[PDB]
Ligand binder design. Structure first.
Ligand SMILES: Cc1cc2nc3c(=O)[nH]c(=O)nc-3n(C[C@H](O)[C@H](O)[C@H](O)COP(=O)(O)OP(=O)(O)OC[C@H]3O[C@@H](n4cnc5c(N)ncnc54)[C@H](O)[C@@H]3O)c2cc1C
Length: 304
């Protein structure tokens, strides 16, 4: 139309997306409905899946995050700083009523070289929540991990640990829900890297997804302490990807292929390493190429 269109058109679903509806000064006070440990007792970290009531007052979209202000005060009697957490539920939610939001939280605990145990403020606060407890929420936040508009896109999801969160959100909308305006028929390929089998988050859910959409969904796990490749190397996410290096490289050259990466900071290095060798097989500089993919919204990263 002969209408004014000054702004730039993205390839992601930005229409109707809201950010920072609730801020630290006046957060939304939700309530814990459920909180379940989803890792095995032998897992080295301990991750919990929790659901909060929102009364539908927080219209978040798949891929966004919310902030959590843990109860308590710091030394100066001031509130705790906000900690961000990727939303692990679809917009409709685990209860299917558009009135809740779910988080996938790893309890941060470690011993320093003094033998002293240190505990993260917000992660331990969240994991200790009991149904009925109040929680201060802010946001929603983020535009980086929003889903592609293309219902027939090839979506490659690379995740480590809790980085699986935004992808569980994607996948629920793609395969577990009926949307009259969005019918996914592309290819969803998930790569999830964790240390042990007892750390395999939402495995049962992805299994049911593979069952009802066998030709639209593929999953590959990388358990570093239990698997190894022919060369005898630990199976990290990049190591598993290397088994499909030919296929992944070919997919990246397509216009409807979108890569999303979420998880532990540093996972990008290992992935770049595998890409640099592939890129030079065609006389291409990976970093110059990645920059191009980014401009086209085909390489989205959110690590921490
Ligand atoms: C966009 C975004 C999305 C996120 N999504 C999620 C999510 O879905 N799930 C999730 O669990 N977290 C997520 N996080 C991380 C989360 O925001 C917190 O950083 C994390 O929970 C730790 O906060 P804390 O208050 O418990 O600990 P804090 O008291 O803040 O303490 C952290 C301190 O410990 C150090 N530290 C951090 N990790 C470790 C470690 N593994 N071992 C040793 N020392 C460490 C830090 O350098 C820092 O000094 C996300 C972060 C961002 C920015």
């Amino acid at each position: 139309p002969a209408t004014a269109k000054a702004k730039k058109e993205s390839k992601k679903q930005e229409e109707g997306v809201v950010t920072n509806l609730y801020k630290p000064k006046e957060p939304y006070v939700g309530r814990c409905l459920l909180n379940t440990k989803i890792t095995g007792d032998d897992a080295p970290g301990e991750t919990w899946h929790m659901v909060f009531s929102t009364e539908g007052k927080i219209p978040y979209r798949e891929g966004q995050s919310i902030g959590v202000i843990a109860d308590g005060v710091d030394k100066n009697g001031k509130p705790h700083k906000v900690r961000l957490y990727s939303i692990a539920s679809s917009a409709i939610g685990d209860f299917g009523d558009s009135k809740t939001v779910s988080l996938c939280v790893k309890r941060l605990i470690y011993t320093n070289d003094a033998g002293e145990i240190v505990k993260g403020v917000c992660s331990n606060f969240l994991c200790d929540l009991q149904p009925g407890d109040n929680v201060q929420i802010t946001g929603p936040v983020g535009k980086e991990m929003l889903m592609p508009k293309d219902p027939n896109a090839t979506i490659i999801m690379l995740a480590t640990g809790t980085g699986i969160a935004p992808f569980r959100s994607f996948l629920w909308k793609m395969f577990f829900e009926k949307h009259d305006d969005y019918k996914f028929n592309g290819l969803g390929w998930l790569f999830l890297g964790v240390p042990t089998s007892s750390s395999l988050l939402y495995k049962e859910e992805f299994g049911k997804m593979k069952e009802r959409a066998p030709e639209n969904f593929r999953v590959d796990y990388a358990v570093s302490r239990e698997q190894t490749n022919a060369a005898g190397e630990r199976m990290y996410i990049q190591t598993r990807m290397a088994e499909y290096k030919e296929e992944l490289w070919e997919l990246l050259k397509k216009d409807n292929t979108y890569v999303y990466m979420c998880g532990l900071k540093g996972m990008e290095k290992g992935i770049d390493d595998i890409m640099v060798s592939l890129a030079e097989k065609d006389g291409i500089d990976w970093f110059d190429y990645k920059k191009q993919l980014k401009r086209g919204d085909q390489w989205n990263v959110e690590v921490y």
